[PDB]
Design an enzyme around this catalytic site. Sequence first.
Site, short mmCIF file in Angstrom:
data_model
loop_
_atom_site.label_atom_id
_atom_site.label_comp_id
_atom_site.label_asym_id
_atom_site.label_seq_id
_atom_site.Cartn_x
_atom_site.Cartn_y
_atom_site.Cartn_z
N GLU A 71 29.26 42.45 66.34
CA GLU A 71 29.76 43.82 66.33
C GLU A 71 30.03 44.32 67.72
O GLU A 71 29.46 45.31 68.15
CB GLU A 71 28.82 44.71 65.51
CG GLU A 71 28.95 44.30 64.05
CD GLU A 71 27.97 44.97 63.16
OE1 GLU A 71 27.43 46.00 63.61
OE2 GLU A 71 27.74 44.48 62.02
N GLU A 83 29.30 39.05 57.64
CA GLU A 83 28.02 39.70 57.38
C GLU A 83 28.35 40.87 56.48
O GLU A 83 29.22 41.65 56.79
CB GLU A 83 27.38 40.20 58.68
CG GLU A 83 25.93 40.65 58.52
CD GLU A 83 25.43 41.50 59.67
OE1 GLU A 83 25.28 40.94 60.79
OE2 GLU A 83 25.17 42.71 59.43
O1 LIG Z 1 21.84 47.57 59.69
C1 LIG Z 1 21.79 46.42 59.16
O2 LIG Z 1 21.12 46.18 58.14
C2 LIG Z 1 22.56 45.27 59.75
C3 LIG Z 1 21.75 44.69 60.89
O3 LIG Z 1 20.58 44.11 60.33
C4 LIG Z 1 22.45 43.58 61.64
O4 LIG Z 1 21.65 43.26 62.78
C5 LIG Z 1 23.87 43.94 62.07
O5 LIG Z 1 24.68 42.78 61.91
C6 LIG Z 1 24.44 45.07 61.30
N1 LIG Z 1 25.61 45.69 61.54
C7 LIG Z 1 25.81 46.68 60.65
C8 LIG Z 1 27.00 47.64 60.58
C9 LIG Z 1 27.11 48.61 61.79
C10 LIG Z 1 25.79 49.34 61.97
C11 LIG Z 1 24.75 48.78 62.72
C12 LIG Z 1 23.53 49.43 62.84
C13 LIG Z 1 23.34 50.66 62.20
C14 LIG Z 1 22.02 51.37 62.30
F1 LIG Z 1 22.06 52.17 63.34
F2 LIG Z 1 21.83 52.06 61.18
F3 LIG Z 1 21.02 50.49 62.38
C15 LIG Z 1 24.37 51.23 61.45
C16 LIG Z 1 25.59 50.57 61.33
C17 LIG Z 1 24.67 46.67 59.85
N2 LIG Z 1 23.87 45.68 60.28
#
Ligand SMILES: O=C(O)[C@@H]1[C@@H](O)[C@H](O)[C@@H](O)c2nc(CCc3ccc(C(F)(F)F)cc3)cn21
Lengths: 74, 385
Positions: free
Chosen positions: B67, B185
């Site tokens: 990301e 993912e």
């Molecule tokens: O949040 C997750 O479950 C997974 C993580 O586990 C992973 O490491 C990662 O690949 C990932 N990208 C996203 C989308 C963008 C994002 C990131 C973080 C947040 C927040 F800030 F909520 F954590 C909000 C949106 C979700 N994720």
Amino acid sequence: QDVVDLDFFTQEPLHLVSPSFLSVTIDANLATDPRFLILLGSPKLRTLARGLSPAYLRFGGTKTDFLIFDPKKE
Amino acid sequence: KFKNSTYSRSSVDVLYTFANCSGLDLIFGLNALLRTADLQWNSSNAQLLLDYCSSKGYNISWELGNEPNSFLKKADIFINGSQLGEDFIQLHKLLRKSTFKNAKLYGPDVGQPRRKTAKMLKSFLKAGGEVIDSVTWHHYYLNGRTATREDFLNPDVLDIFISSVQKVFQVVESTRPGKKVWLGETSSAYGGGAPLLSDTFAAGFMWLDKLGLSARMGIEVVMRQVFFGAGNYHLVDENFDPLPDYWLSLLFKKLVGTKVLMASVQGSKRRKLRVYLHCTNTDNPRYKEGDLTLYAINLHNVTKYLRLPYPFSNKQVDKYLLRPLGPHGLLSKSVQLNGLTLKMVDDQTLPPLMEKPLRPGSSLGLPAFSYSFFVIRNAKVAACI
Ligand SMILES: O=C(O)[C@@H]1[C@@H](O)[C@H](O)[C@@H](O)c2nc(CCc3ccc(C(F)(F)F)cc3)cn21
């Protein structure tokens, strides 16, 4: 109506997926669990894993960019 | 909120063995935040990893970054798509000089596309699109903290995916047409998933829908977050027991083949009744080239019956109907297949999945808030052979 009729298209395939279409990931942050090695040794877990063969296993996550290889580390 | 950590040769070994012994192909996300003065990727840590992997005979595919659209927010550093492409080129070179010079390389694992994520992807593809074997991007429906049970059942929500897929393809097709596109993912909700939802029978609607649409729309590979781990969206819980989405995933594997056909309902309204069609999986010994697998999701509050186009209307069909084991209804963590509950036999032994054979011509019952697969035997569809 409780009965519904469908349209099937079957002349030619629209797309072809990989045999590994349904694949899985492990979050890169699990590398920071102390018992990483123990966890992945689980027979229960490996049996489940073989259940979804063939598939890709992607190791990545937010933590992908906050991990570093240490050749000295045991 | 996030600082660096290390891992060992031992960790790598573990991870590889897990994959190899479990019949899986490992993809490894390298760290893209190791940077020089002039902010080019410093590839020297990766060099050590590659050399160690070579020396061990490890066959591995690689990614670089995760990301990258969020790098500025996650680590106060902005890397532009052009540069990231250059970095992927650097990685390409290193992989070529290694003992496995046909190692695969995938990227850039951007998030779902708003305006600038899309713009970053574009410039990335311009600059470095030539060396990547597939385009990876990620997608989630909701925030795990704001998701309600009603959201996991809402069709309107499921269709926000449609626009996301298309937006990505729009970008790819404008710059590297015909290149493979992968969901790198993806799951139900971000922030670890929504507690007491992402781990239930209710999560299957989003999961099955996502596969259905992905297949149809041209996505070649789908990567579910996560096989297991801390998050609510795990397929396997902390006790190493399978959840509803696991059994769904296993079942999908046994039954759905690679060739993608199509289905829809005649009447305009099918938002709540979702249907999908592929050739049956050839490898199943029970089935044979030409057989069709239809899968279906019912978001109506009452039972629906499906009527098949003739000639298939007179064919012998296997039902695979999935129902939560009570009494927690849709938020149950146990699931039944044609009225037998799905459990491991022991920790080395998966159950067989028993079909419900249907008398030829029998109408197709799909209870409210359920899903099912139907394999149409002796369908002899030319396209599937
Ligand atoms: O949040 C997750 O479950 C997974 C993580 O586990 C992973 O490491 C990662 O690949 C990932 N990208 C996203 C989308 C963008 C994002 C990131 C973080 C947040 C927040 F800030 F909520 F954590 C909000 C949106 C979700 N994720």
